[PDB]
Amino acid sequence: KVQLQQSGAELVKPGASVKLSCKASGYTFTEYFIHWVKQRSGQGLEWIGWFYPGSGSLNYNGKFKDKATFTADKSSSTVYLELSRLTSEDSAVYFCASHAYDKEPYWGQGTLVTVSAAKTTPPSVYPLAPGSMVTLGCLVKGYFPEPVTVTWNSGSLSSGVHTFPAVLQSDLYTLSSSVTVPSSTWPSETVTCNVAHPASSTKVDKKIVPR
Amino acid sequence: DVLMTQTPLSLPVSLGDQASISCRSSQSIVHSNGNTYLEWYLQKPGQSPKLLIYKVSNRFSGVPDRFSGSGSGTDFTLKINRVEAEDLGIYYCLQGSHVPLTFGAGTTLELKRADAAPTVSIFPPSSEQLTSGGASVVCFLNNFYPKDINVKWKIDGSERQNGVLNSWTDQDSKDSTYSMSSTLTLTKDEYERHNSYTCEATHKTSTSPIVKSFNR
Numbered sequence: 001k002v003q004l005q006q007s008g009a010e011l012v013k014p015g016a017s018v019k020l021s022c023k024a025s026g027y028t029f030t031e032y033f034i035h036w037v038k039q040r041s042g043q044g045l046e047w048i049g050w051f052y053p054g055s056g057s058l059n060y061n062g063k064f065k066d067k068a069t070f071t072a073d074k075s076s077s078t079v080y081l082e083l084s085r086l087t088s089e090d091s092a093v094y095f096c097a098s099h100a101y102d103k104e105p106y107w108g109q110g111t112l113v114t115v116s117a118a119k120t121t122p123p124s125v126y127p128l129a130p131g132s133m134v135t136l137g138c139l140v141k142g143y144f145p146e147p148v149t150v151t152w153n154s155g156s157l158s159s160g161v162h163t164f165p166a167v168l169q170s171d172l173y174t175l176s177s178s179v180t181v182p183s184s185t186w187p188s189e190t191v192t193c194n195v196a197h198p199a200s201s202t203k204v205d206k207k208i209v210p211r
Numbered sequence: 212d213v214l215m216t217q218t219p220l221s222l223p224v225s226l227g228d229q230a231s232i233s234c235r236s237s238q239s240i241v242h243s244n245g246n247t248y249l250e251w252y253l254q255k256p257g258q259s260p261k262l263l264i265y266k267v268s269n270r271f272s273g274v275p276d277r278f279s280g281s282g283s284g285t286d287f288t289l290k291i292n293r294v295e296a297e298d299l300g301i302y303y304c305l306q307g308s309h310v311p312l313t314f315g316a317g318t319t320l321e322l323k324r325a326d327a328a329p330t331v332s333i334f335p336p337s338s339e340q341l342t343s344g345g346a347s348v349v350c351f352l353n354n355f356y357p358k359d360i361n362v363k364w365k366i367d368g369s370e371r372q373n374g375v376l377n378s379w380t381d382q383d384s385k386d387s388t389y390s391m392s393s394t395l396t397l398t399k400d401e402y403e404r405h406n407s408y409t410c411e412a413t414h415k416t417s418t419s420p421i422v423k424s425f426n427r
């Protein structure tokens with residue numbers, strides 16, 4: 001079975017370089033092309049180039065000639081994509097894909113690359129209370145890296161919840177979560193957002209109280 | 212480079228519907244070896260693209276027979292016969308005939324439902340954040356349909372564009388709606404120097420924006 005194993009998620013300092021790996025198995029390594037494809041969050045797919053380990057031949061999309069370098073280690077059936085001098089525009093998932101000439105390609109699962117100078121930082125969690133149904137929320141601000149896990153009332157409150165994708169601003173992530181409940185349930189009963197951040201090994205609770 | 216133009220950008224469908232997606236190339240994509248390397252992919256959130264069709268019309272192994280591809284020259288089409296829930300996602304065409312290889316911009320297949328205006332809720336900075344010296348104003352625009360929407364912030368009647376960050380959810384698994392969060396972040400100093408804060412939601416369901424506000 002043809003398999004491609006891509007390296008784990010990368011947190012890269014701005015301006016630095018990063019080398020991603022794609023390790024292949026299940027076929028003759030030197031006889032398949034490897035392609036790399038970029039996908040920025042919420043955007044489409046962009047072809048970076050092709051590399052043929054069996055000859056060292058390659059071609060780069062002109063848009064990437066100053067950014068990407070392909071290399072290989074035949075002794076480990078691995079091809080590398082090195083990205084130089086990273087900027088925010090380089091934050092993306094990078095997929096590798098492999099195929100024999102005139103045959104269908106197999107894609108790896110992708111490697112997430114995130115550019116930030118931040119160290120591991122737990123979130124500040126802030127209650128969002130209003131000034132038949134009522135909407136409450138929590139603001140989860142200033143953490144690094146992804147992910148966090150947000151629940152309401154330790155998971156018991158799951159309907160009517162919207163947890164929004166985080167956005168990176170000033171090297172740190174911010175997200176919000178909303179929950180909507182019957183007016184006859186709050187503030188008469190307790191509504192609490194729970195926020196776990198595995199990287200900092202923290203979990204905090206914030207009860208939503210009326211203003 | 213070869214430009215791949217996909218239409219429509221988004222296609223609302225009901226389960227069991229027929230679906231048809233078009234991909235047009237800006238020039239011929241017949242490779243010198245005589246083959247046409249045109250592929251279709253389906254991608255779901257947080258996953259790699261999955262190959263559906265290769266060389267125009269050949270269904271990839273393990274792909275349900277309800278998917279079919281056709282086309283010639285610059286003119287290609289993907290069809291789905293009786294759409295199922297696992298078919299929802301973004302479809303991309305890819306030409307592999309001429310370097311640089313190029314993708315279409317994607318077509319989103321989404322579940323159709325009744326139009327629905329957003330439920331808009333605005334929130335002043337928490338006391339806790341203010342104590343820490345920060346000030347974030349949060350606006351939730353929840354459970355609307357279709358997905359296109361615009362938000363505008365007004366401070367004391369004046370439109371603010373700096374310091375606004377937006378986030379959007381994927382289509383809801385239970386009610387097929389969409390939601391959006393918009394956060395306006397200021398220093399505490401500047402927050403206390405104004406009175407009225409306003410988030411305005413423009414959506415197809417009304418000619419007038421839904422306006423939500425609070426006064427310090």
Ligand SMILES: CCCCC[C@H](O)/C=C/[C@H]1[C@H](O)CC(=O)[C@@H]1C/C=C\CCCC(=O)O
Binds near residue numbers: 035100101242
């Ligand atoms: C992400 C891209 C996946 C692959 C798309 C598509 O299946 C590949 C098409 C190939 C085809 O197999 C041969 C060919 O020339 C196309 C382009 C790929 C590499 C260039 C080889 C040139 C040379 O041999 O020197």
